[PDB]
Design a protein around this ligand. Structure first.
Ligand SMILES: *[C@@H]1O[C@H](CO)[C@@H](O[C@@H]2O[C@H](CO)[C@@H](O[C@@H]3O[C@H](CO[C@H]4O[C@H](CO[C@H]5O[C@H](CO)[C@@H](O)[C@H](O)[C@@H]5O)[C@@H](O)[C@H](O[C@H]5O[C@H](CO)[C@@H](O)[C@H](O)[C@@H]5O)[C@@H]4O)[C@@H](O)[C@H](O[C@H]4O[C@H](CO)[C@@H](O)[C@H](O)[C@@H]4O)[C@@H]3O)[C@H](O)[C@H]2NC(C)=O)[C@H](O)[C@H]1NC(C)=O
Ligand SMILES: *[C@@H]1O[C@H](CO)[C@@H](O[C@@H]2O[C@H](CO)[C@@H](O[C@@H]3O[C@H](CO[C@H]4O[C@H](CO)[C@@H](O)[C@H](O[C@H]5O[C@H](CO)[C@@H](O)[C@H](O)[C@@H]5O)[C@@H]4O)[C@@H](O)[C@H](O[C@H]4O[C@H](CO)[C@@H](O)[C@H](O)[C@@H]4O)[C@@H]3O)[C@H](O)[C@H]2NC(C)=O)[C@H](O)[C@H]1NC(C)=O
Ligand SMILES: *[C@@H]1O[C@H](CO)[C@@H](O[C@@H]2O[C@H](CO)[C@@H](O[C@@H]3O[C@H](CO)[C@@H](O)[C@H](O[C@H]4O[C@H](CO)[C@@H](O)[C@H](O)[C@@H]4O)[C@@H]3O)[C@H](O)[C@H]2NC(C)=O)[C@H](O)[C@H]1NC(C)=O
Ligand SMILES: *[C@@H]1O[C@H](CO)[C@@H](O[C@@H]2O[C@H](CO)[C@@H](O[C@@H]3O[C@H](CO)[C@@H](O)[C@H](O[C@H]4O[C@H](CO)[C@@H](O)[C@H](O)[C@@H]4O)[C@@H]3O)[C@H](O)[C@H]2NC(C)=O)[C@H](O)[C@H]1NC(C)=O
Ligand SMILES: *[C@@H]1O[C@H](CO)[C@@H](O[C@@H]2O[C@H](CO)[C@@H](O[C@@H]3O[C@H](CO)[C@@H](O)[C@H](O[C@H]4O[C@H](CO)[C@@H](O)[C@H](O)[C@@H]4O)[C@@H]3O)[C@H](O)[C@H]2NC(C)=O)[C@H](O)[C@H]1NC(C)=O
Ligand SMILES: CC(=O)N[C@H]1[C@H]([C@H](O)[C@H](O)CO)O[C@@](O[C@@H]2[C@@H](O)[C@H](O)O[C@H](CO)[C@@H]2O)(C(=O)O)C[C@@H]1O
Ligand SMILES: CC(=O)N[C@H]1[C@H]([C@H](O)[C@H](O)CO)O[C@@](O[C@@H]2[C@@H](O)[C@H](O)O[C@H](CO)[C@@H]2O)(C(=O)O)C[C@@H]1O
Ligand SMILES: CC(=O)N[C@H]1[C@H]([C@H](O)[C@H](O)CO)O[C@@](O[C@@H]2[C@@H](O)[C@H](O)O[C@H](CO)[C@@H]2O)(C(=O)O)C[C@@H]1O
Ligand SMILES: CC(=O)N[C@H]1[C@H]([C@H](O)[C@H](O)CO)O[C@](O)(C(=O)O)C[C@@H]1O
Ligand SMILES: CC(=O)N[C@H]1[C@H]([C@H](O)[C@H](O)CO)O[C@](O)(C(=O)O)C[C@@H]1O
Ligand SMILES: CC(=O)N[C@H]1[C@H]([C@H](O)[C@H](O)CO)O[C@](O)(C(=O)O)C[C@@H]1O
Ligand SMILES: *[C@@H]1O[C@H](CO)[C@@H](O)[C@H](O)[C@H]1NC(C)=O
Ligand SMILES: [Ca+2]
Ligand SMILES: [Ca+2]
Ligand SMILES: [Ca+2]
Lengths: 388, 388, 388, 388
């Protein structure tokens, strides 16, 4: 039982291969399955787990009505082995309407936020016990990543933001050792309006690609120095931008430094990672709505502003199907650290009004150095077959 | 593995942070979930478990009718990891309409009482086998804590009562080693009625805050010497009293020694713990019924008779929602012993007569030395969605 | 991991204390629960398991119709931790309409009989793999204990019968090492019909109390020598006889040697055990049907022919409620080997014709050297509340 | 833990004894159970697991409609302990409409194929992580064994085919070390079409008996050299042929070398294994459809062309009941390697059109050196009791 250091090079991938799918909504029409949203994946050194925020109810249940609402006291963090759908034997790890989890090589850390919008509490649970907590600092919806945190040599880091809703984002980067907060660093650099960071180890530090909670369709970047707690930040250079809504590729812009003002309505959590000068990224296929999902490599997408040449595109979910939040997780291999991602497949409200609930399933892909084909792996439920 | 000694100082807490919630009743409307009451939480050295007394039936089941009653032969002690709701794969640990459980560092002890009101049997199960038993000594509902027992150096102590619910009874403190009763001591001291003790390690001894069902709305205290088996008892000093029913805050009293004779008949299981001269305690918000739940610190609440200065109040369940029993459990951290509590959230009878059943969910909080905000975490089920 | 030898004295027993109850039938009215019969209990060195023969269906299921029949190809041996009811996640350990199981200290042996009445197959599965098998030797319902087998120093023994249910049959005692049949001994001694033996370790040998289905309401005894494989047999001395049907106590007899010819046809699986000259035993309360269940000690019940002085009676199931098969299991304590028993609580056909199925729950008690009270712990389902 | 080498002789067998049955379809009428097909069994060194390809739905679920189709994006590989039916807590190990799995002594390998018919992807998951992938090489339904792969000394081998189902195709044998493809060998030898290989260790190599879907109703054999990666192939010598369809026993033939051109188009997955010059094999009882299942030894069936002398026949499923795929798995005993097999019991479409779904249960038998009787162990569901 040694601490993870993630001190291997990043795997040099050619694209992604199918890893997992849970079929939650299809099963929900013939079984008792939790209503969820904001899922993610994180792995201990041996095996992977799927997480999501429950809505305190199963789908075929009158309490499923109005589950489009983001925050209620009954939301809890669910945790199963990856591919075990959220059945009634699922453990609720903590009370949470916003969360992040990660394993440090020895045990699990869970960051769980619940309570009043104006005065939330974040609990820090490590190795099965509550070790620390912090209250809201801006009194305006304290929130965190909705994907895995990252630990190096026993110190885990997680990004949180309070006050972005009111246009006064106060973003802080926490450093946590065995559940205890040992340092808090304010955001520094040129990133603004940070929400929902998707972070990954990039030894010796941690790098996050997030979303801008005002009008940037280009994604913020946060760099975390684990040695001295210093922070820097910017925007992804790629002219093929990662958020939705967004302009078409021809009329999209990013200068690597500032938000581009090219998204007019609420954006979506997503991810990307650098490989030298290039950038691997995912995004919705639609530029208007959370439908479809595609991945590709942008040539110069990390280093060159407004870079727009891509290669190695893959469709994950075709544009006739709903997507949602997406995020990165990292998995240690023999010789390298691999990058994987999940896609939230949102069903029900607001897009599908036959039913009165909102829930999701997931699909999960992992980096590969090998070869692969094509397909599309959507949620797959028939909305007309569902309990309403 | 080694026996627990709990020989660390008590954590110096600033209040409590959210830890767990099971949503049992909301789930029961769309899933097969046990009917329960008298829940509690207890942890082995690695992880926490939720316990409750089943009623031998699920909620959506005609057998859930009449479950307001406390004692039937079909009640069994249920045990799951904390946050796993009581689904059909839940283990029934023993036959019990009253119970207590605890882990000594090596194995679980369960104390399970069942049978005739006039002639009950308590079974003592340790490390998976029945080791001892004792029969009723007063022929009037032999009964115990309904929360965790406490073990130091391999000796587990539990408080049991037999006799009148509305007059002098026969309370005994048992000392149990690897499931075998090794000593039994009579209650001594000035407490006049003892039920449903909430006990905690206070090395080298154990301290319990209980329910007086006869003449006191102040809570009795039992002090257990684990070295020589001597017993003392008194009442919590705080003029802000912990039982329900009770007088309002302006007219309630305690003198630390005698029951206050203030709405003293009846009561509810609850808890408190000392910190120096001060007292941390929970209670229902209502002074009349099991409605709402709040915690606070009483300055001088341990040492000073009739102290009423409070600080650090937190609402756990607002007064528009039902509560129920509550109890303490203790969790060993790196440097100190933390105190946590659960609240039973009773739904159905007698308060909600639209349905014919009585069941509960739970919410659980743990001490923190950090900061926190506010909220309310009630059961959350809509009584009108439930099967009757 | 060492082999069990059971080489400690039998525990002092003053009677029995409640240990477990599964509430299977009550749960079946609001949940997906297996239809079963022929249950039993057996423990590995750390924990106990409940076993039963499934009927290849849940109760609330059209396939539950006409499950009164004892042998169909869909019967499988179910195995859960004791107290975990037979939910849909239950493992089916082998195909079986008759079975026995036991743990040798290192791994589980299962003896599983299935197939045609006139040509059945017994499979021997050990440590998760099929190691041996034997075919029917008398072409008339090869069948075994329906309770735990017994292992000493890595050799497990089990009693099996083939041939007439109402006349002379061919009973053999098998000796099995790591799943392999290493010896077979014919039944010898004065027992004239042996079925459904309830066996226990009495180091260095094994002792069984069985069912005579032909000529006796007194129970046969089989003694097994594990050193030279020799077998002896006789009848329990007690004039308070253990089978059902039987004469009333005033006209019932046993001479320790021959079947009593007192309502000697038919019968039910049961148990007893010796303690010096005395006998601890269970039986149904009714002398006509499988109704009620009582235990008591017969003074001289082991050594003295026709002894009828009983003491220490306990009602387990009152005579207004259905019972069924019962059997013994043994549990190793720190200093002695304890004796426990289970009772099958049969519900449905043929006694209860409102429903079309037959199933059971269980209740389980363990020997105690302590004290205890009284009660009754029947199945508890309301036949009117059940799916038919 | 050490790598498996399977370096023990094959167990003596006299026939097969009952091992497991899951009753999936019977249970589906009163419980939430996955719709599946293409099941198989594989064991780690300690215990066995059942696998199958889910259809992304339970049976009693409108999404079960039209699950006769073999490939949709929602198919995932399910894995439970053997005998645990596919309930809602079952883990979906990967996305797959064709699969193979095996344990190398240290960890599990899963080969999972999904995506577009003309451009599928195979993922290779080992020890809980994606290690490699390969894309379709013939752009026509990349597909694999639907039963266990085989590993010797840390190298696992699996047979895969891409191309026509009704003409020459492109079959390759992969060699995989800790999830990484280290070599790929083209099919060589006289086998003209290879699908759905049932492979087993035959130290120092691996031997496979497969399905020729083009010109043969005799089963092809593939021999795999694990040391130098060389491949040979032929046909099973037995004149009693193993595919369906096939000619009757009087007019069927095999010459060991070439497809027999006897009702050679179409087929079903099955198995056989050698013992010296003799052959043990299973097949459907019907020569036309997947009805019934029988096993027998063919004297000289491995070495003598057109041998038809069968002996030691056993009915596994009588010819009034549906069967389906069947396959081999191998289990290491104390001194020898045993051979076992499973039979898929297909219910629903296309044979049973009362219902709109297609699913299966399983029955499993293992080699025995002992004796046995007779029986028939079909699926057992009443099609008239099923949800449609
Ligand atoms: C209770 O259960 C048991 C176990 O399940 C069951 O016993 C099995 O019964 C089946 C059905 O009868 C047996 O399977 C059949 O075997 C038939 C062949 O067996 C005879 O021929 C064998 C081969 O002979 C050829 O080869 C030899 C050289 O090897 C050569 O000399 C011969 O001339 C010939 O060329 C031979 O090996 C075998 O020998 C055994 O028995 C003889 C006595 O006769 C003995 O001397 C030997 O020592 C040895 O023990 C034997 O002579 C085979 O024809 C038959 O297949 C046909 O019928 C089935 C239908 O049944 C058709 O489907 C099929 O298409 C064929 O037309 C089948 O394979 C099986 O062997 C038994 N198992 C065992 C272990 O004994 C009982 O019957 C059950 N009891 C009841 C009443 O239910
Ligand atoms: C966000 O979340 C936090 C944490 O939950 C909330 O802060 C908590 O608020 C409650 C309610 O106000 C506090 O509990 C109360 O404490 C007072 C006692 O303190 C007051 O009176 C003291 C003299 O008796 C005085 O010294 C105090 O002022 C000093 O200290 C405070 C810090 O404690 C500091 O902020 C000041 O600057 C001073 O230095 C203070 O004025 C107690 O009287 C209350 O009990 C009465 O009221 C309750 C109802 O509120 C009633 O039910 C009782 O019967 C009784 O009549 C009560 O215990 C608690 O201490 C705060 N916690 C912390 C850690 O500060 C915060 O309010 C939330 N904000 C929002 C907007 O949601
Ligand atoms: C079988 O599967 C393989 C593997 O998935 C697949 O090969 C891939 O094809 C895609 C599409 O041609 C390639 O990705 C493209 O790369 C070019 C650069 O060479 C880019 O210009 C492309 O982007 C443009 O076109 C996209 C639509 O295709 C637009 O969405 C985008 O906005 C741009 O306009 C795109 O990135 C990919 O590199 C290969 N992968 C590999 C490893 O070769 C193959 O096509 C499939 N076979 C068949 C018959 O379809
Ligand atoms: C949940 O269980 C409760 C408790 O059983 C049940 O409520 C009860 O319903 C029964 C009727 O089924 C009521 O029975 C009556 O009790 C009164 C006394 O209060 C008697 O006087 C009645 O007897 C008269 O009516 C009979 C009708 O046949 C006549 O035969 C008889 O001669 C008398 O005229 C009768 O027995 C009982 O009062 C209630 N109890 C309560 C608490 O309401 C309830 O129905 C169950 N719920 C569900 C959904 O099934
Ligand atoms: C509280 O619980 C205790 C313990 O269970 C219980 O004491 C037990 O009472 C029974 C019944 O009196 C005792 O068993 C009897 O022992 C006498 C010999 O002393 C026998 O003669 C009895 O057998 C006859 O009577 C039976 C009916 O009781 C008949 O069924 C039988 O055929 C015989 O005619 C019987 O064995 C038992 O010894 C005590 N146990 C102990 C440890 O003292 C007590 O009665 C309970 N009290 C209440 C109020 O419920
Ligand atoms: C969950 C809930 O309804 N809580 C109420 C509570 C209960 O209704 C009551 O205790 C049950 O017997 O009632 C409380 O408030 C008082 C009421 O008893 C009264 O009817 O109305 C009063 C004011 O007009 C007063 O509010 C209480 O016990 O505190 C209030 C609580 O919300
Ligand atoms: C659970 C139950 O109903 N038990 C009854 C029992 C059964 O009804 C009966 O044995 C089933 O056939 O009946 C008993 O009561 C009486 C017998 O003692 C008597 O020998 O026969 C009577 C009828 O002729 C009568 O039924 C019993 O077996 O003890 C009593 C019991 O409560
Ligand atoms: C499970 C079952 O019904 N098995 C039948 C089987 C099937 O009905 C049939 O193969 C499906 O197409 O039919 C079999 O017997 C006969 C055929 O051999 C014959 O060619 O045609 C008959 C009239 O239709 C009948 O089908 C068979 O394949 O062996 C018999 C079997 O019990
Ligand atoms: C063994 C037993 O019946 N315990 C019950 C006790 C006693 O009735 C009470 O303490 C008086 O003795 O009351 C409860 O706590 C209660 O009030 O809700 C329920 C609990 O089941
Ligand atoms: C293999 C088998 O069928 N065993 C059955 C036996 C035998 O019928 C009986 O011992 C006569 O031989 O009866 C039972 O125990 C019984 O009476 O309830 C049920 C059991 O299933
Ligand atoms: C990947 C795939 O589709 N495999 C399917 C194969 C192929 O159709 C067949 O081998 C011809 O290539 O047939 C089955 O085995 C079958 O006949 O029941 C079902 C299976 O799902
Ligand atoms: C059970 O089966 C019997 C015999 O076929 C039949 O008469 C009865 O109606 C069935 N019961 C139910 C509830 O379907
Ligand atoms: Ca009181
Ligand atoms: Ca008899
Ligand atoms: Ca063919």
């Amino acid at each position: 039982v040694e601490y993870r250091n993630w001190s291997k090079p990043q795997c040099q991938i050619t694209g992604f291969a199918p890893f997992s799918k849970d079929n939650s909504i299809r099963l929900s029409a013939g079984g008792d399955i939790w209503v969820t949203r904001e899922p993610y994946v994180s792995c201990d050194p041996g095996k992977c787990y799927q997480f999501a925020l429950g809505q305190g109810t199963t789908l075929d249940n009158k309490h499923s009505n109005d589950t489009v609402h983001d925050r209620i006291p009954h939301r809890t963090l669910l945790m199963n082995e990856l591919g075990v759908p959220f059945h009634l034997g699922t453990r609720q790890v903590c009370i949470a309407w916003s969360s992040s989890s990660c394993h440090d090589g020895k045990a699990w850390l869970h960051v769980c936020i619940t309570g009043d919008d104006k005065n939330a509490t974040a609990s820090f649970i490590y190795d099965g016990r509550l070790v620390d907590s912090i209250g809201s600092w801006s009194q305006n919806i304290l929130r965190t990543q909705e994907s895995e945190c990252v630990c190096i040599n026993g110190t885990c880091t997680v990004v949180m933001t309070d006050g972005s809703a009111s246009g006064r984002a106060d973003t802080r980067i926490l450093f946590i050792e065995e559940g205890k907060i040992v340092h808090i660093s304010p955001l520094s650099g040129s990133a603004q309006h940070i929400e929902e960071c998707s972070c990954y180890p990039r030894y010796p530090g941690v790098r996050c690609i997030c979303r801008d909670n005002w009008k940037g369709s280009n994604r913020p970047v946060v760099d975390i120095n684990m040695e001295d707690y210093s922070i820097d930040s910017s925007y992804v250079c790629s002219g093929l931008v990662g958020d939705t809504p967004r302009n078409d590729d021809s009329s999209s812009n990013s200068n690597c430094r500032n938000p581009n003002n090219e998204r007019g309505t609420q954006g979506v959590k997503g991810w990307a990672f650098d490989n030298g000068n290039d950038l691997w990224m995912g995004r919705t296929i639609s530029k208007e709505s959370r439908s479809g999902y595609e991945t590709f490599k942008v040539i110069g997408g990390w280093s060159t502003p407004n870079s727009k040449s891509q290669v190695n595109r893959q469709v994950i979910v075709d544009n006739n199907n709903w997507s949602g939040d997406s995020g990165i997780f990292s998995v240690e291999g023999k010789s390298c650290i691999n990058r994987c991602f999940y896609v939230e497949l949102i069903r029900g409200r607001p897009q599908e009004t036959r039913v009165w609930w909102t829930s999701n399933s997931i699909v999960v892909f992992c980096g590969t150095s090998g070869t692969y084909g094509t397909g599309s792996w959507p949620d797959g439920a028939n909305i007309n077959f569902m309990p309403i």
